[PDB]
Amino acid sequence: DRFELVSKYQPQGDQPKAIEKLVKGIQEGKKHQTLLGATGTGKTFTVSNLIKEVNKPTLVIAHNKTLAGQLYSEFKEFFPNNAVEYFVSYYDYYQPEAYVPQTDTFIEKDASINDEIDKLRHSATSALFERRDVIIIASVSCIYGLGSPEEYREMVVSLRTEMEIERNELLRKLVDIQYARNDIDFQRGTFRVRGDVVEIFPRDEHCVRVEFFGDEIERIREVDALTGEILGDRDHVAIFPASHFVTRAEKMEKAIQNIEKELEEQLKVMHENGKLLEAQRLEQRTRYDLEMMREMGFCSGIENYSRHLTLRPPGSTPYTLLDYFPDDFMIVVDESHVTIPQVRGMFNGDQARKQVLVDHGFRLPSALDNRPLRFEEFEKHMHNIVYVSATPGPYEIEHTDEMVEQIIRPTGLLDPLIDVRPIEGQIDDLIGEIQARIERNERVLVTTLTKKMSEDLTDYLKEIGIKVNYLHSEIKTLERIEIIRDLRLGKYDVLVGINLLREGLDIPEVSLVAILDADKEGFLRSERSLIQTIGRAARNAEGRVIMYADKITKSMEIAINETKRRREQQERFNEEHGITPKTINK
Amino acid sequence: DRFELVSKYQPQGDQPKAIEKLVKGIQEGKKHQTLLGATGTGKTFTVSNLIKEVNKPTLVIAHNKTLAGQLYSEFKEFFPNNAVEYFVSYYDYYQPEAYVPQTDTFIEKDASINDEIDKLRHSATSALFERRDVIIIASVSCIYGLGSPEEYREMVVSLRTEMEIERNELLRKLVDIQYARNDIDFQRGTFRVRGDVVEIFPASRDEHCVRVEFFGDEIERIREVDALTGEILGDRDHVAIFPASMEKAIQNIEKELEEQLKVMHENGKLLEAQRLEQRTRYDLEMMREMGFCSGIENYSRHLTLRPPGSTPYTLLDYFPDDFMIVVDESHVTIPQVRGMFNGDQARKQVLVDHGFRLPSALDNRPLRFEEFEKHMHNIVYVSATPGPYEIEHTDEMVEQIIRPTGLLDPLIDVRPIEGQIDDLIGEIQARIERNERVLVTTLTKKMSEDLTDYLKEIGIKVNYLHSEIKTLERIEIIRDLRLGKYDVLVGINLLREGLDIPEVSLVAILDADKEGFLRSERSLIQTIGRAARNAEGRVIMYADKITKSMEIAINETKRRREQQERFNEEHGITPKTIN
DNA sequence: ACTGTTT
DNA sequence: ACTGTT
Ligand SMILES: Nc1ncnc2c1ncn2[C@@H]1O[C@H](COP(=O)(O)OP(=O)(O)O)[C@@H](O)[C@H]1O
C-alpha cells in the first residue's frame, strides 16, 4: 500500500534540497518541522514529494474552504490512484445559538446542510478504515466532535456481493439506523421488500437494490429514482443513517434520567444564588427538550446533550477525525501562521459563547462538554508535523529546531524592490505611478487602513478617469473570481482596498503594490502581513512595492530586510544558471 | 412620479429611429410590438428610453436568472432615483413532490429558501402599492401563484414616520400576523414593548431588529438594529413587517375528500383511496392544531374560499391596468411562459390519479398562456430573432441592426463534410498563430468528446463544455479561454451566456445540415453571433446539403452585414476589435 | 438544447 | 483583517 505520484515534471530550484531535508527529518524522528516556502516555489509539489517518500496517512489543514478546495484539486491531480479526500463543514450556512446580554436578545440556531459535502466527509472517514494511502484535505472541522471510530463501524450497513446475511437481519440493521419500512409509500429514509429484493432509498434521488439468492446477496445495483434507469451494478455498498444524528435507542433512557439529575442540581444552584428568571428559563427549555426526546427520540439542539447521550464522564475529551487516523500519521499545516492561531482559537470562542448561554439559563453546564479540541488536546495527537508558510508564526518558530527554506522560484522571478516614500504628497506620487503603469499595460493594487480612506481614493481616482474597483471586506467566492478576472483582462487598471491578502490577487499583470500608511498601527501593517502584501508584486518581472510612511517601523524594517535577503539569494541563483526572468511565465 | 433616465451617452446608430417608432406605437394604441435588435446595438438603453417617454409601471421578463441579473444591474444604473426591482424564485433548491409510476416511487418535496431573494421579492411587491415609477425585472416566477394583493394589504404591517397609531393597536396588528409577545425571552418572531418603545424581531438570516419609538400615539422614530451586536444599523422613514409564518376551509376540504372517496371506491381504486384518507386526514389535524401543515400550498384554493377552476393571483395582479411588459429574448421566453402550466398540471395529475393529492391541488398552479394574454395591456417583444408568436402579433417590425462600434456580422463559408476535421484543424492551427480563439459546435456528446481527445493528441489547448455546467464553472471556462489557457472550445450548446468573446474570430458549426433544435433557423443565427465581437469574424458551416434553416440564417446575416457595411461607408468607420 | 418554475 | 465552526 504505497502513494504513486503522477507528474510529468521533476523537482526544480530548491525543491530537491527541501524534500531531502524534510524526509531525513521524519526518518531522524523529528516531530515539528517548518517549510519556509515563498509563494511561487511549488509548495504543494514539495509536499507531494514528501508524502510519497515517507508513505504515511496524511492530513492537510487549511485555514479556509477556498484554499482547501484548491489543495484538493492540486493533490487529486498528483495522486489519481490513491485516496485523496475532502473533509470540511457540511453546513452551507451556520448561525450558532447565542445570547446578546448587551441587548437581552436570544439568537436561535439556524443551519442548512450541503448533502454533497456530507457524502465527501463519509468518503473521507470510511477511507481511513480501508487503506493507508490516504490524504485528507481538511479545515478546522477536523478538531470538532465526531463519533467514536468503533461507533462508526457499528452504525453503517456495509453490504458486499455473495455475502451471507438473513434478509430479516438486514431489515433490523436498517431500522437500527433510522430507516422505516414502507412498501406502499416508498421514499427517502425508507426501504421496501418486493420479492427476494430489498430496495433502499437514502439528496440525489438514488437508491440501492439488493437482490437475494436465499441468504446470500445475489446482486447490488444503483437505480435512478426519478427515471427507474438501472444506473449501474455494484460489488460493495455502505448505507448511512436516514437521520442527521440518530442516537443509539438502548442507552437513551439512562441519558434522559442523567440530564434531569443535572437539571435538578443546577436549579438548587441557581435558586441558592437568586438567579430566578434564569432558573425559570432553564426548567422551561430543558423539560420541553426532554419530552421531545421521550416522544420522537430527537429534539432541536440534541447535540448539546451529547455528553449525557454517550454516557461518557464530565470533562471528557471529544472524539475527532484525528482519532480515525493511525498512531503513525502526518499532519501538514498550510499558511501555518494563520491556521495555528485559528485551531488554537476555536475552543476559547466556543466555550465563551456557551458560557454566556449557561450563565443566563439557556443551557445546562454539560453543554460545554460538546466542543472542539483544546490546543493542548490537538498537540497530544501530533506524531509528525510540517508547518508550511512563507512567514512562519511564533509557535512554529519555537517548535522547529532548524528552518527548511524553499525560496528559489523555477521561473527565476525575484521578490520585489521596495521604495519608501514620504506621506507628504502621498496621493499625487501614487497617481503618477498609476498613470505610468497604464502606459506600460501593467496593473496596480493599493492598500489603506480604513474603508473610508479606501472609498475616498476610489471616488477621486474615478473622477480623474482611472478605471478602478474598490474591494469590499465581505466578498463572495465569485465576486472575487470576477474582480481578479476583470483586472487581468484590463476592465480595471487599479484595485483599492484594505486587505490584498485575499486568494488569487497574485496576478502576473500586477507590477506595482502601493502600501498607503505603511508605518501605522494595524494587523495588516505587521511584519508578516507586509511580507505577504509585498508578495502580490512578485509574479511580475518588473515587480515593485511603494511604502508611504514618515517613520521606518520595526515591522517595516524586518519586511524590507527579509525581501532583500530572498531577492539576493534568487539573483545569485539566476547568475549561476544564466536566467533572465519573464513575467506571466513560460 | 416620472422616470428620470441618468445617462452620459446619447442615442447613436439606429437607436433614435427605433425609440421614435416604438413610442409612437404605444401612443397610437398598439397592441403588440417587436424590437428586432441585433446583439451589440444596446437594446436595454432603447428600452430605457421607451420606459422614460411612455411613463408607465413596467415588467421585464427574462428566460433565465443570469440574464435577469444583468438586466437589473443595467436598469439600476439608468434609473437610480426610481424603483428598480428584482422578482425571481426564492428557492436555492427545489425538488417538487412527485410520483414515479414506472417504479412506484414517491418523491417528497425538498426545498431550501434564499432569504436575500425573499427580501428582494417583498421590496418588489410592496413597491407596486407605493409608487408608479416601478421597473420589475422578473423570471417566469411572475406567472406563478401569489396571495390576493387585497390579502397582502391586510396581512402586512406597514409603518411610516409621523403615522399616528395606538401603541396597543400595533401590538394587535402584530399578533394578528404570527408574532408572539415575549419581553422575557426576546427572539425571532416575537415583539417586546420596552418604554414608549416596541422592538420587533423579524423573520430570517439578516438578524436585524425594527425598533419603533412612539411619542404618545405617534411613531416618533423607526430604526434598524443589528441583533447579533446591538449596533443601530440605520434610521428608517418607512418599514413593512411581514408575517412570522380558516374553519370553513377545513370543512370544505373534508367535503371534497368524502366526495373523492366515494368516486375511488366505486372504481375499485382502494389502495389510492387508503393513501388519500391517510394523507388528507393527517394534514387536517396538523391544520386544526398548528394552523399550518407541510404542503399547505396544495390546499390554497380552499384556504382562499375561491370557487373551483379559479385563476390564481399573480404578480401581474399587483400592477395597474395601464402597465407595460417587455419580453427579453422573446423567442425563448414566450415558449417558456406558454409551457409552464402544461408541465405543472401533468405532474399534479399523476399525484391526483394515485391518491397523493385531492383534485383541488391542480387549482394551485401557474397561469395558462390564455390567462397571461388577458393581462397584456402594452407588450414589447425584444429579440435578435423574433419567434412565430411575436411575428403573428406585431403589425410592423422595428429593426435596430446598426452597431455603435461599426462591428459587422460574420462571413459564412459552407464547406463539405468530406475532409471536415483536417480542414477545421488547419483553420484552428492558423488562428493560434494569429492569437485568436475558436468555438466548435457538434450535435452529439460522442462527436464532442471525440474531437476534444483528438485535438488534445495533436497538441491544441482545448476544453469540452458539459451540457450541465454551473454559473462559476461557466465564468471560469470563458475567463481561461479569453486569457489563452485554452485556444479552442468544443461542445453542443454555444448559446450559453457570455460565450461571445472579442478574442473569438472563428465559429465552426460541424453537422450544420443535420437537424436538431440547435440547427434551426434561430439557433444558427445566435451561433453566428458568437463571432460578431471580432473585426475578422468568420463562420464555417460543415454540411453536404443546404437546409431551409441554413439558407435563412445565411441570408439574414448577408442582409445585416450589408446594411452595416453601407452605414460604415456613409459615416467613414473602420471596425476594431475592442478587448 | 437548456434554463424556468411551484405565497 | 478575516475566516473557521456533526
Ligand atoms: N517542478 C515543477 N515543474 C512544473 N510545475 C511545477 C513544479 N513545481 C510546482 N509546479 C506547479 O507550479 C504552480 C505554481 O506554484 P504555486 O503558485 O506556488 O502553487 P503551490 O504552492 O500551491 O504549489 C502549481 O500549479 C504547481 O503544481
mmCIF file of N, CA, C and O in Angstrom, chain B residues 207-242:
data_model
loop_
_atom_site.group_PDB
_atom_site.id
_atom_site.type_symbol
_atom_site.label_atom_id
_atom_site.label_comp_id
_atom_site.label_asym_id
_atom_site.label_seq_id
_atom_site.Cartn_x
_atom_site.Cartn_y
_atom_site.Cartn_z
ATOM 1 N N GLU B 207 -30.673 38.920 10.618
ATOM 2 C CA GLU B 207 -30.563 39.008 12.078
ATOM 3 C C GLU B 207 -30.598 40.471 12.490
ATOM 4 O O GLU B 207 -29.685 40.982 13.152
ATOM 5 N N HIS B 208 -31.664 41.150 12.033
ATOM 6 C CA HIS B 208 -31.917 42.570 12.245
ATOM 7 C C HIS B 208 -33.185 42.781 13.069
ATOM 8 O O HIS B 208 -34.039 41.893 13.113
ATOM 9 N N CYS B 209 -33.315 43.961 13.705
ATOM 10 C CA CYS B 209 -34.481 44.339 14.505
ATOM 11 C C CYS B 209 -35.011 45.688 14.130
ATOM 12 O O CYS B 209 -34.238 46.617 13.871
ATOM 13 N N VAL B 210 -36.344 45.809 14.166
ATOM 14 C CA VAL B 210 -37.029 47.058 13.933
ATOM 15 C C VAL B 210 -37.372 47.593 15.324
ATOM 16 O O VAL B 210 -38.056 46.912 16.090
ATOM 17 N N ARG B 211 -36.827 48.775 15.675
ATOM 18 C CA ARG B 211 -37.092 49.469 16.939
ATOM 19 C C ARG B 211 -38.002 50.672 16.613
ATOM 20 O O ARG B 211 -37.631 51.579 15.850
ATOM 21 N N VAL B 212 -39.237 50.604 17.122
ATOM 22 C CA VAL B 212 -40.263 51.621 16.929
ATOM 23 C C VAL B 212 -40.396 52.412 18.220
ATOM 24 O O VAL B 212 -40.778 51.848 19.243
ATOM 25 N N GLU B 213 -40.038 53.710 18.166
ATOM 26 C CA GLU B 213 -40.137 54.658 19.270
ATOM 27 C C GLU B 213 -41.427 55.446 19.058
ATOM 28 O O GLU B 213 -41.639 55.989 17.969
ATOM 29 N N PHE B 214 -42.340 55.401 20.047
ATOM 30 C CA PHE B 214 -43.654 56.048 19.955
ATOM 31 C C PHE B 214 -43.891 57.233 20.935
ATOM 32 O O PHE B 214 -43.821 57.062 22.156
ATOM 33 N N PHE B 215 -44.161 58.441 20.376
ATOM 34 C CA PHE B 215 -44.436 59.676 21.122
ATOM 35 C C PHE B 215 -45.951 59.824 21.417
ATOM 36 O O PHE B 215 -46.673 60.553 20.725
ATOM 37 N N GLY B 216 -46.414 59.063 22.407
ATOM 38 C CA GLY B 216 -47.792 59.049 22.882
ATOM 39 C C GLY B 216 -48.717 58.145 22.091
ATOM 40 O O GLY B 216 -49.368 57.257 22.653
ATOM 41 N N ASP B 217 -48.791 58.389 20.777
ATOM 42 C CA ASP B 217 -49.646 57.688 19.816
ATOM 43 C C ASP B 217 -49.118 57.916 18.406
ATOM 44 O O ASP B 217 -49.751 57.513 17.432
ATOM 45 N N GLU B 218 -47.989 58.629 18.301
ATOM 46 C CA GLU B 218 -47.291 58.971 17.061
ATOM 47 C C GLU B 218 -46.087 58.024 16.931
ATOM 48 O O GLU B 218 -45.539 57.608 17.952
ATOM 49 N N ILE B 219 -45.661 57.686 15.701
ATOM 50 C CA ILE B 219 -44.441 56.898 15.569
ATOM 51 C C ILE B 219 -43.330 57.938 15.458
ATOM 52 O O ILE B 219 -43.163 58.545 14.400
ATOM 53 N N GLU B 220 -42.634 58.217 16.584
ATOM 54 C CA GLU B 220 -41.557 59.217 16.630
ATOM 55 C C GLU B 220 -40.354 58.832 15.728
ATOM 56 O O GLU B 220 -39.935 59.656 14.910
ATOM 57 N N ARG B 221 -39.853 57.573 15.826
ATOM 58 C CA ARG B 221 -38.733 57.080 15.010
ATOM 59 C C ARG B 221 -38.793 55.568 14.800
ATOM 60 O O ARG B 221 -39.219 54.848 15.704
ATOM 61 N N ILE B 222 -38.417 55.105 13.592
ATOM 62 C CA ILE B 222 -38.347 53.684 13.250
ATOM 63 C C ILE B 222 -36.901 53.441 12.777
ATOM 64 O O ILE B 222 -36.510 54.020 11.758
ATOM 65 N N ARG B 223 -36.077 52.664 13.573
ATOM 66 C CA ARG B 223 -34.644 52.377 13.286
ATOM 67 C C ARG B 223 -34.218 50.884 13.339
ATOM 68 O O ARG B 223 -34.520 50.194 14.314
ATOM 69 N N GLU B 224 -33.492 50.411 12.291
ATOM 70 C CA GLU B 224 -32.983 49.036 12.156
ATOM 71 C C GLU B 224 -31.813 48.787 13.118
ATOM 72 O O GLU B 224 -30.962 49.662 13.291
ATOM 73 N N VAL B 225 -31.801 47.618 13.782
ATOM 74 C CA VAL B 225 -30.803 47.249 14.799
ATOM 75 C C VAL B 225 -30.170 45.892 14.495
ATOM 76 O O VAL B 225 -30.882 44.952 14.153
ATOM 77 N N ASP B 226 -28.840 45.789 14.675
ATOM 78 C CA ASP B 226 -28.076 44.562 14.492
ATOM 79 C C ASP B 226 -28.338 43.674 15.711
ATOM 80 O O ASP B 226 -27.844 43.998 16.795
ATOM 81 N N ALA B 227 -29.110 42.557 15.543
ATOM 82 C CA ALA B 227 -29.470 41.650 16.654
ATOM 83 C C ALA B 227 -28.264 41.020 17.350
ATOM 84 O O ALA B 227 -28.242 40.921 18.578
ATOM 85 N N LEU B 228 -27.252 40.640 16.551
ATOM 86 C CA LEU B 228 -26.007 39.994 16.977
ATOM 87 C C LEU B 228 -25.029 40.933 17.702
ATOM 88 O O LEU B 228 -24.161 40.442 18.411
ATOM 89 N N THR B 229 -25.172 42.263 17.546
ATOM 90 C CA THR B 229 -24.259 43.254 18.145
ATOM 91 C C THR B 229 -24.932 44.271 19.079
ATOM 92 O O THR B 229 -24.279 44.735 20.027
ATOM 93 N N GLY B 230 -26.155 44.689 18.737
ATOM 94 C CA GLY B 230 -26.884 45.747 19.441
ATOM 95 C C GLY B 230 -26.704 47.103 18.767
ATOM 96 O O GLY B 230 -27.322 48.096 19.182
ATOM 97 N N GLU B 231 -25.829 47.129 17.706
ATOM 98 C CA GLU B 231 -25.469 48.268 16.859
ATOM 99 C C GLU B 231 -26.701 48.762 16.052
ATOM 100 O O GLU B 231 -27.436 47.936 15.487
ATOM 101 N N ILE B 232 -26.940 50.112 16.042
ATOM 102 C CA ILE B 232 -28.049 50.799 15.365
ATOM 103 C C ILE B 232 -27.773 51.007 13.854
ATOM 104 O O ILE B 232 -27.520 52.114 13.392
ATOM 105 N N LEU B 233 -27.852 49.892 13.103
ATOM 106 C CA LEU B 233 -27.647 49.685 11.659
ATOM 107 C C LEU B 233 -28.110 50.814 10.688
ATOM 108 O O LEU B 233 -27.676 50.833 9.522
ATOM 109 N N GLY B 234 -28.989 51.711 11.161
ATOM 110 C CA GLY B 234 -29.518 52.826 10.375
ATOM 111 C C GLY B 234 -30.943 53.237 10.707
ATOM 112 O O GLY B 234 -31.753 52.407 11.133
ATOM 113 N N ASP B 235 -31.261 54.535 10.481
ATOM 114 C CA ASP B 235 -32.581 55.137 10.702
ATOM 115 C C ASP B 235 -33.467 55.050 9.435
ATOM 116 O O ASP B 235 -33.007 55.363 8.333
ATOM 117 N N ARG B 236 -34.737 54.625 9.608
ATOM 118 C CA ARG B 236 -35.718 54.462 8.520
ATOM 119 C C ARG B 236 -36.930 55.412 8.648
ATOM 120 O O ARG B 236 -37.197 55.936 9.740
ATOM 121 N N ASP B 237 -37.640 55.646 7.510
ATOM 122 C CA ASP B 237 -38.838 56.501 7.417
ATOM 123 C C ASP B 237 -40.091 55.661 7.152
ATOM 124 O O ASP B 237 -41.189 56.052 7.554
ATOM 125 N N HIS B 238 -39.914 54.506 6.487
ATOM 126 C CA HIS B 238 -40.963 53.551 6.170
ATOM 127 C C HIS B 238 -40.440 52.162 6.493
ATOM 128 O O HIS B 238 -39.238 51.914 6.368
ATOM 129 N N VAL B 239 -41.324 51.252 6.907
ATOM 130 C CA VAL B 239 -40.976 49.855 7.178
ATOM 131 C C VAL B 239 -42.183 48.932 7.038
ATOM 132 O O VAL B 239 -43.301 49.306 7.421
ATOM 133 N N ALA B 240 -41.972 47.752 6.448
ATOM 134 C CA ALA B 240 -43.052 46.802 6.274
ATOM 135 C C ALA B 240 -42.701 45.519 6.990
ATOM 136 O O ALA B 240 -41.701 44.870 6.658
ATOM 137 N N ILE B 241 -43.489 45.191 8.022
ATOM 138 C CA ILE B 241 -43.317 43.973 8.801
ATOM 139 C C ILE B 241 -44.093 42.843 8.105
ATOM 140 O O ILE B 241 -45.265 43.017 7.754
ATOM 141 N N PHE B 242 -43.417 41.703 7.879
ATOM 142 C CA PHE B 242 -44.002 40.538 7.226
ATOM 143 C C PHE B 242 -44.269 39.414 8.224
ATOM 144 O O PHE B 242 -43.575 39.323 9.236
#
